DNA sequence: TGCATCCGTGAGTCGAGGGTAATAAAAAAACATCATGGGTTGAGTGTGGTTATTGGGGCATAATCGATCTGTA
């Protein structure tokens, strides 16, 4: 009653979490020092730390 | 003296895949350096050339058979 099952979908989810938080670590500077008007949202995010 | 605190320890052969990745700026000048290409050394490998021959065949100069008409009891 104190053990838990962990199965695939749960870790993989953890690691797109973990994805997540390495683009947010990124994109809270990208916007504060980032253009106002121009900023297409697609050139401004990375899809390798995920 | 009692307290927390830190520091080593802890098997053995074996196999199969075996490597993955958060990010980043451009100019200019200045200099170093290898890369190729063309030209002297030079270093070969290449090729004919005269002169030492040693078996072989040869012509001389000798030699040992093969066949018939004149001399002796």
Same mark, same amino acid.
């Given at each position: &009653?104190? $053990?838990r099952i962990? %199965?695939?979908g749960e870790? =993989?989810?953890? #690691?797109?979490?973990? &994805?997540l938080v390495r683009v947010? $670590? =990124?994109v809270k500077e $990208?916007? %504060?020092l980032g253009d106002l008007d121009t900023?297409?949202? #697609?050139?401004? @995010?990375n899809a390798?730390? @995920?």
């Open positions: &009653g104190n $053990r962990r %199965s695939v870790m =993989a989810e953890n #690691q797109f979490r973990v &994805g947010e $670590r =990124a $990208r916007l %504060s900023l297409m949202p #697609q050139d401004m @995010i390798k730390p @995920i």
